[PDB]
Design a protein around this ligand. Structure first.
Ligand SMILES: *[C@@H]1O[C@H](CO)[C@@H](O[C@@H]2O[C@H](CO)[C@@H](O)[C@H](O)[C@H]2NC(C)=O)[C@H](O)[C@H]1NC(C)=O
Ligand SMILES: *[C@@H]1O[C@H](CO)[C@@H](O[C@@H]2O[C@H](CO)[C@@H](O)[C@H](O)[C@H]2NC(C)=O)[C@H](O)[C@H]1NC(C)=O
Ligand SMILES: *[C@@H]1O[C@H](CO)[C@@H](O[C@@H]2O[C@H](CO)[C@@H](O)[C@H](O)[C@H]2NC(C)=O)[C@H](O)[C@H]1NC(C)=O
Ligand SMILES: *[C@@H]1O[C@H](CO)[C@@H](O[C@@H]2O[C@H](CO)[C@@H](O)[C@H](O)[C@H]2NC(C)=O)[C@H](O)[C@H]1NC(C)=O
Ligand SMILES: *[C@@H]1O[C@H](CO)[C@@H](O)[C@H](O)[C@H]1NC(C)=O
Ligand SMILES: *[C@@H]1O[C@H](CO)[C@@H](O)[C@H](O)[C@H]1NC(C)=O
Ligand SMILES: *[C@@H]1O[C@H](CO)[C@@H](O)[C@H](O)[C@H]1NC(C)=O
Ligand SMILES: *[C@@H]1O[C@H](CO)[C@@H](O)[C@H](O)[C@H]1NC(C)=O
Ligand SMILES: *[C@@H]1O[C@H](CO)[C@@H](O)[C@H](O)[C@H]1NC(C)=O
Ligand SMILES: *[C@@H]1O[C@H](CO)[C@@H](O)[C@H](O)[C@H]1NC(C)=O
Lengths: 403, 68, 184
């Protein structure tokens, strides 16, 4: 017996783009600031160029993770996909933001001179891209990330997914109601569990809190004396005498520029880490969604069947579909079957004997079939295989060549 | 990010845009601005982003497509 | 270009300050100049390490694609090229590499009417590797990515179960070659 479960794996994509007013943050409304700062060469153009490059890289990451298709597919008006309840996943038009209930739950759970830029792709367009991707991986199979989309009925696509993991498709067609009920129960369970557990949104909350704290500590550093006389421009450039005021304001702007350089270096390193995570999420979107990936523990714990992405604030969330077998059963095997002085070997599976009778079965499911010469290929003779057992093999057409 | 009530003019959800008229039609994005506004030289116009053609595909219970 | 910055000193030439002022003030001027130039050099080195880390990540990705799309065939969907994968070649470029992925794009489709199983003689038939495709009157089994139809035979189908458990089954005959073989 097999149990189908859905698991969550959350990956951030992009943080908030930032732009800094350089000479306004250093010191504003002072000609002495200008004639002391423009003689520092270029310690400001470098910072502005690096931060704008970071913003462009965040835009590129947002474009790369979600815009893997050049079409906006629309779901068919039929809501009967074969008994599967695609209502917590496929978006509905009654909501004002055109978002799925899981996206709504995830968005509701997640909660001078420094300027925060807005992203190019707003959340409505990200939700539209995810709706198009769900339409593509429901009604078109996996043959739409490679060429044009093709109509595939959903039970046959799911049978293809079972055929991808070494299990014959017929076990789907004798268990369709059970698979549909298990999938719907798993979807409802994960919908409840995304709200029941409070610490299931670590990465997105940590990245937005890190951005907020790194932006707050700069403004906190704006009001420190840095070993100078004071921390106010109108106090240091009016009460003092310019022979010492020039040195004091040079020390103060040197400290402020050092703090700004530290902030830019921290933002560069965090953006590099976010870029690596976004590349990993793009690989996940290209493999675990647009097709089946046979490698273990990259698209969910267990054998992988499909996955559905959902839009998230400052990132993406994945809902994998995994095939987890259970209900083990002990048996006695043999590497080969001996018959008439020649050995037989299984074509697709393994020779399994419960008691005094032998059967051939597929590898990941118990389906006993009578040993025929259409389930075996002969090779060599019966004196060298270690552990071979004696048993007759059914020939095909026995009662037919003499009738 | 400046509400230009003190300094054709079309107001985006990114600040003020001066010198670019607004067109209700939509085209592919060339120069990104933010909040789903992209401007290109057709004069200079600013339009809502086009995500692509609405290539809807039919679905049934017994319909399959095979390339030839 | 940072050499021509005064850094709050009198000038940006070390020979000029040392040959025009007394050493008590020249010490302060050269100290400010040396700490400014040292800060500039540290900034350049930090930028170089960041860019080198990014280039290291990109070069590891390039070696990944070289080992997994030139030395062999990759079954990962949309990892090398837009479409199904065949093979690829590397070409050398200054300070980089350029691949030429060779892909397989199955355009010009034509849709049909299908069913997951065929019922005959009280038992259900399932396709071994293809899909049951009907063009309206007869039935055929064809490949999953190229429409080359073949008549249904017992040698490319496997039987399991009966006609009642599976849904969506249809009624059609199946060709068994032993019936035209036995009478001859
Ligand atoms: C395989 O396991 C599933 C559940 O893990 C079984 O489905 C349950 O079956 C019992 C009785 O057999 C019912 O009372 C439950 O309502 C079923 N649950 C669901 C969700 O449908 C299934 O019967 C098992 N199949 C085999 C062959 O053991
Ligand atoms: C999917 O499962 C739900 C579980 O009950 C079905 O019922 C919906 O339940 C939610 C929350 O309990 C309500 O907000 C909806 O209004 C319910 N739907 C209806 C039509 O009343 C839901 O019907 C199932 N969907 C399908 C397509 O079977
Ligand atoms: C091992 O399993 C096989 C098949 O499940 C059993 O073979 C059948 O068992 C039933 C139950 O008595 C008999 O009515 C059939 O005649 C058996 N088939 C054949 C071809 O002999 C087998 O009995 C099981 N082994 C044990 C020790 O129980
Ligand atoms: C469905 O395909 C079959 C096989 O290609 C077609 O059957 C053949 O049709 C041609 C054209 O009239 C005849 O010359 C052949 O003798 C037919 N072969 C047979 C009957 O085995 C069939 O016509 C196609 N159906 C439609 C509606 O196009
Ligand atoms: C199978 O046998 C092993 C020992 O050989 C035992 O530990 C295990 O519990 C058995 N499993 C079942 C399902 O009986
Ligand atoms: C039964 O198996 C044993 C061990 O493989 C072998 O020695 C013996 O000849 C076999 N009996 C036959 C083939 O009748
Ligand atoms: C700009 O300010 C006016 C008056 O306060 C307000 O009506 C308008 O909505 C503001 N613009 C935006 C884009 O909110
Ligand atoms: C598919 O089956 C459902 C279930 O009854 C039915 O409502 C729908 O009309 C069917 N679709 C077609 C195209 O016949
Ligand atoms: C699918 O086939 C039906 C008739 O069988 C046809 O009306 C429809 O246009 C076809 N779909 C496509 C995309 O060609
Ligand atoms: C197939 O034949 C059986 C037995 O005559 C019948 O019950 C069933 O309705 C038939 N199905 C179709 C689709 O004709």
């Amino acid at each position: 017996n097999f149990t189908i479960s859905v698991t969550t794996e959350i990956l951030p994509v992009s943080m908030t783009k930032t732009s800094v007013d350089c000479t306004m943050y250093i010191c504003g409304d002072s000609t002495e600031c200008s004639n002391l700062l423009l003689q520092y060469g270029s310690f400001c153009t470098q910072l502005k160029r690096a931060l704008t490059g970071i913003a462009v890289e965040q835009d590129k990451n947002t474009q790369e993770v979600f815009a893997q298709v050049k079409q906006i597919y629309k779901t068919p008006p039929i809501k009967y996909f074969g008994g599967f309840n695609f209502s917590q996943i496929l978006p509905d038009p009654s909501k004002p933001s055109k978002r799925s209930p899981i996206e709504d739950l995830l968005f509701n759970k997640v909660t001078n001179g420094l300027t925060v830029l807005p992203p190019l792709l707003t959340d409505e367009m990200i939700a539209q891209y995810t709706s198009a991707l769900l339409a593509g991986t429901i009604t078109s199979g996996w043959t739409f990330g490679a060429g044009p989309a093709l109509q595939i009925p959903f039970p046959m696509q799911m049978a293809y997914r079972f055929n991808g993991i070494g299990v014959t498709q017929n076990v789907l067609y004798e268990n369709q109601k059970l698979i549909a009920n298990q999938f719907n129960s798993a979807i409802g369970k994960i919908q409840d569990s995304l709200s029941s557990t409070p610490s299931a949104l670590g990465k997105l909350q940590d990245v937005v809190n890190h951005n907020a704290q790194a932006l707050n500590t700069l403004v906190k550093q704006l009001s420190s004396k840095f070993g100078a006389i004071s921390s106010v421009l109108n106090d240091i450039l009016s009460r003092l005498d310019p022979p010492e005021a020039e040195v004091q304001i040079d020390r103060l702007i040197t400290g402020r520029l050092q703090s700004l350089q530290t902030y830019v270096t921290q933002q560069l390193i965090r953006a590099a880490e976010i870029r690596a995570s976004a590349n990993l999420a793009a690989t996940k979107m290209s493999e675990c969604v647009l097709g089946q990936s046979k490698r273990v523990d990259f698209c969910g714990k267990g054998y992988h069947l499909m996955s559905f992405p959902q839009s998230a604030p400052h990132g993406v969330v994945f809902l994998h579909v995994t095939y987890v077998p259970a209900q083990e059963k002990n048996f006695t095997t043999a590497p080969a079957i001996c018959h008439d002085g020649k050995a037989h070997f299984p074509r697709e599976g393994v020779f399994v004997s419960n008691g005094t009778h032998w059967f051939v079965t597929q590898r990941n499911f118990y389906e006993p079939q009578i040993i025929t010469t259409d389930n075996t290929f002969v090779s060599g003779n019966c004196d060298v295989v270690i552990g071979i057992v004696n048993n007759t093999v059914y020939d095909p057409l026995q009662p037919e060549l003499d009738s | 990010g400046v509400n230009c009530t003190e300094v054709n003019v079309f107001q985006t959800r990114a600040g003020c845009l001066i010198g670019a008229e607004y067109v209700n039609n939509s085209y592919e994005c060339d120069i990104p601005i933010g909040a789903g506004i992209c401007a290109s030289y057709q004069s200079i116009i600013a339009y809502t982003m086009s995500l692509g053609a609405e290539n809807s595909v039919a679905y049934s219970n017994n319909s399959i497509a095979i390339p030839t």
